[model samples]
Target: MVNMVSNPGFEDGLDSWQDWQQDMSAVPEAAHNGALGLKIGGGKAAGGGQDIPLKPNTTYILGAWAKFDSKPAGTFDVVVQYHLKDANNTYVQHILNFNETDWTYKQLLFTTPDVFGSTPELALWKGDTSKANLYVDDVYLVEV
Candidate 1:
């Protein structure tokens, strides 16, 4: 079984494409939600130790619906990364970038075979943290 996270505000999903403009509390604000939300920024980053044991022979998908509420003039970026924890508890990471700036919602679907199998977690990053906010919801994951 795939465990899914709860989205309270957007829990109902988008009523209409335009409804995203009204409120975004349903979309959880997290370092990892940006790529799924289509907004790029700096300073916000997330990392975790190997909570899930990944296997090279399995296929998996990473996906989410996201939008940008605000963006700055510089190079703001949204990215996903995987990491490994060393004996000292230090982390080694690899990342993929998903950058966007717009009010409309977009869904990103990614499929990889053991892309980060040995890594313990999926991490999210924003290039700049001060001037941008990304709205995201309805994240889904499937194994096929």
Candidate 2:
């Protein structure tokens, strides 16, 4: 099954993520499309499922349409992280960085092996909030 987690522009705690709703200009079509649009619940990571396996040789596409209030003036970043439970039941995390320069509409294409960790799982996807704020739309993860 494919599951979508969305941000609705407000944080009502974790349970709110399941049936979340809010307003933001980032994603309008998604509201009618039945997928979580870039709002508050989205662009923020609370926590979710992880334990799926990814074969080493497969490539998956993770894409998003992002619009900023203004063009980025310096090096900007977005990340795709995968997590899994190790032997000790502790989560191990891996990260891949996508560089954005405010030059064009942004999308990230990632092949699984491109990651720097020992293993990768389809646990969670997030947009970086530790830096400047931006709006995201049409976010998708396709395992192909």
Candidate 3:
């Protein structure tokens, strides 16, 4: 019904999201909408996810605006990891490949299991590449 992300546009500068990995820095010069965006350098993993208390049996959409310069040796992934009750974890990932240097939007829609509650984790991973940088903004998670 509404967007569940607190700092969906990275305007607050990493205020609400949790950094689970490396080199996840906020830059003021690059952004999809606002003046600020999140950046992960080459050969490093960055960009973190916000965990929201979710209801079971709910459908949600996760997405972000991402871009990069040049081409990398390997591709990275914009990934969402959901944690359900009973220790169940589900992953939804969108791959950002080499030669795709334009600003792109990617999303994943997922439904929670029939549990009481759960948490969702979103992140950008630069997998084994040292020639590219990933810039991300306008991240979101919304209930449908």
**Candidate 3, 16-123: lDDT as tens digits:** 867767567778755879789887776664456665676677787777787776666666566656544565454333333322578788777877678632355555
| Better-scoring candidate (lDDT), 1 or 3 | 3
Indicate the residue-level lDDT of 108 in model 3: 76
Q: Model 2: per-residue lDDT, tens digit, 24-138? A: 3334432323343343233333222223445555665654444333333332233345533344444434333333424234445555542334444332233444333344433
Q: Which residue runs of candidate 2 sit more than 4 Å off their true CA positions?
A: 1-53, 82-104, 114-133
What's the CA RMSD for each of the models?
9.0, 7.9, 3.1
Q: Which scores better on TM-score, 2 or 3?
A: 3
User: What digit string (tens of lDDT, one per residue) describes model 1 on residues 64-98?
Assistant: 44444465332322222343333444443333334
TM-score of each: 0.44, 0.40, 0.79
Ranking by TM-score: 3, 1, 2
Global Cα lDDT for candidate 2: 0.37
Off by over 4 Å in 3: 84-99, 116-118
CA lDDT, every prediction?
A: 0.37, 0.37, 0.67
TM-score of 3: 0.79
Report the error of model 3 at residue 113, Å: 0.5
Question: What is residue 87's positional error in candidate 3, in angstroms?
Answer: 8.3
User: Candidate 1: minimum summed lDDT over ten consecutive residues — where?
Assistant: 15-24
TM-score-wise, the better of 1 and 3 is: 3
